[PDB]
């Protein structure tokens, strides 16, 4: 299944959105977190599902300095 997140609107798979314990509690549509930070969370979900238990080497998840604090706060909440 697919689920909808709101900051802007984002749609991700439920197997990806389950990477968040908080979203896995709310889902068992969610509106929050600015779009520029919630899209970065949607990019982390794709990064996590792609590279968890991957046989390849794994690339550093890139984080911009200006979003570091906003994204840390969101990640600590999620």
């Amino acid at each position: 299944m697919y689920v909808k997140l709101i900051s802007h609107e984002f749609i991700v798979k439920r197997e990806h959105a389950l990477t968040s314990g908080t979203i896995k509690a709310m889902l068992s549509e969610v509106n929050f977190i600015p779009s520029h930070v919630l899209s970065k969370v949607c990019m982390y979900f794709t990064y996590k599902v792609r590279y968890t238990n991957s046989s390849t080497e794994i690339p550093e998840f890139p984080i911009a300095p200006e979003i570091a604090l906003e994204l840390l706060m969101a990640a600590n909440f999620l």
Partner: peptide, 6 residues
């Protein structure tokens, strides 16, 4: 890229 989709 998963961490930087197009």
């Amino acid at each position: 890229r998963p961490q930087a989709p197009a």
